[PDB]
């Protein structure tokens, strides 16, 4: 229920006392990208640093208050998140010749959102001991992000010509370092870190939180495509747009001559009647039943691995994320 | 000379305890970075030299051998960007994914390798913070520039129009200008204690000195003495977004551009050659030469004579060699 305020919190400050952004001409423009990229709504990534944080503080052990401040300096990790997921998202908005000056202005948008995270951890987190493993993490999610993005760069171009580009290692790679890294692992390790702790002694934990989010991506692509566009507010698109699902990747494995001739011919146009045409050998996969198959599977695979850590406060973190998650219509 | 023997030391400290796939971790090191040029390392180690034997706090003497060391470390820091940022040039329709995937995890081994080199060797010092600064700039700037080469080879397979002065422009600015000639100069400055926040000048002279020589190698790569060179011109054959493509496509607006569509077999690689001498280019080298080296020098002594002294001496290493 509570407005996260901080976000112009942190724009006053970059766009003032830093070490860029002199000229007001600069500073609007500089605002324009800022805002274009960074708060669109939604939010629930940053904001589960906050959920994290106010869990572990609950559980742990004494020492034992809440200051204003605390939920200020989580909140600021929360939208380091939102930043990260806003220089990830740059490029998957497409729509020839025209491509690399479009691709040029999207990465120096990208390029610019960028150097806003150093600084923010410098401003709010030089003092803190756990500053240079803040700075550690960061890099390690940025530099996941990063290679994820170009990889998922070469697939949709690539994509574009020839969709038997799209594979499930291909898939699952971008999936993992593109999203899976920044969405689910960074938000808990950052409230861990903010609490004065170590990573490599939690590396259990991160299999399970970037299968989940691999899970959560999946859980997406089956949604944009079977979801009761009544209950979204807006229908799914993906097949329209040419989009890397892991439907269309299972079904290229599973799928005949006949029926990749029918992927070929249909998938990527607009027409209305292909984009069912698609729907229909979906279903005639039985693919929702293998989803049904892969959700029971990894929600029992992921039920047990985490039961069997140690910190129990983690354990009730990670069943808090995989119960808000589960079977979701949202 | 200097026979850098550490690289052996600076692997082994990151090799060494890691299951048994130590080799392949070792592979990729190997395969990547050590060249056995390694001009992106020297000069580091160069322009420490002579940013060193500039400030005159006493008596000018050589370096120490622990100082040899922190500068070469850096410089072989500067290897492994330069690796990173090289990892997808020999790239080769589908399965480009699968051959990038590869590649982006190769560079994400790599690109983890330079925090810890950078800890393990600069962990103590008050310019620390400032190399994080300094390698996650040229880092991105690096990583820009190859998504927007990326995007800008494969819309180079479908229309040759899409090649373009800016998009040349900007991929020689952030995939290579800034590893190659800002970072090694600004190594040797953090080094020195200084802020490169009040070097921004220099900074433009050695991003435009960088863009310069990506010029220069494109029209030696067409217009060369192979047996100087040691290596036949390709990139008009390999497809590359060569300064000679985009200024070729300017000029020609006519029939011109369909004899250069319909292009691109060296039967047809001739016929290029040719329609480029048809535009005087040479004469656009010289003249894009002699505009650019005297911009430059004059930016250069409008400029801590020791920053020009050392941009001087990487101009006329390079000038019309």
């Not at 497409?94 to 990208?110: C, E, H, Q, S, T």
């Amino acid at each position: 229920s509570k407005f996260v305020k901080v976000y112009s919190v942190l724009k006053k400050e970059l766009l003032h006392d830093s070490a860029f952004g002199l000229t007001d001409d600069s500073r609007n423009w500089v605002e324009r990208i800022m805002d274009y990229n960074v708060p669109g709504g939604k939010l629930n990534r940053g904001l589960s640093v906050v959920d994290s944080y106010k869990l572990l503080r609950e559980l742990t052990n004494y020492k034992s208050e809440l200051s204003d401040d605390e939920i200020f300096l989580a909140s600021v990790l929360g939208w380091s998140v939102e930043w990260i997921q806003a220089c990830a998202l740059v490029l998957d908005d497409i729509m020839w010749f025209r491509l690399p000056k479009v691709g040029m202005i999207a990465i120096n948008d990208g390029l610019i959102l960028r150097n806003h995270v150093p600084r923010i951890l410098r401003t709010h987190f030089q003092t803190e001991h756990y500053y240079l493993q803040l700075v550690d993490l960061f890099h390690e999610v940025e530099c996941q992000t990063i290679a994820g993005q170009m990889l998922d760069l070469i697939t949709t171009l690539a994509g574009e010509i020839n969709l038997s580009s799209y594979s499930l290692p291909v898939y699952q790679q971008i999936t993992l370092s593109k999203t899976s890294y920044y969405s689910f692992y960074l938000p808990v390790a950052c409230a861990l870190v903010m609490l004065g702790e170590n990573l490599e002694s939690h590396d259990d934990m991160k299999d399970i939180l970037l299968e989940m989010g691999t899970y959560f991506q999946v859980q997406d692509d089956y949604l944009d495509c079977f979801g009761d566009p009544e209950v979204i507010g807006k229908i799914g698109t993906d097949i329209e747009d040419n989009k890397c699902t892991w439907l269309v990747v299972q079904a290229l494995e599973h799928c005949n001559e006949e029926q990749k001739k029918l992927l070929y011919d249909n998938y990527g146009r607009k027409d209305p009647k292909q984009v069912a045409k698609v729907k229909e050998l979906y279903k005639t996969l039985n693919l929702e039943d293998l989803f049904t198959q892969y959700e029971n599977k990894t929600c029992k695979k992921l039920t047990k691995s985490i039961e069997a850590l140690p910190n129990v406060a983690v354990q009730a973190v990670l069943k808090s994320f995989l119960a808000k998650i589960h079977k979701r219509l949202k």
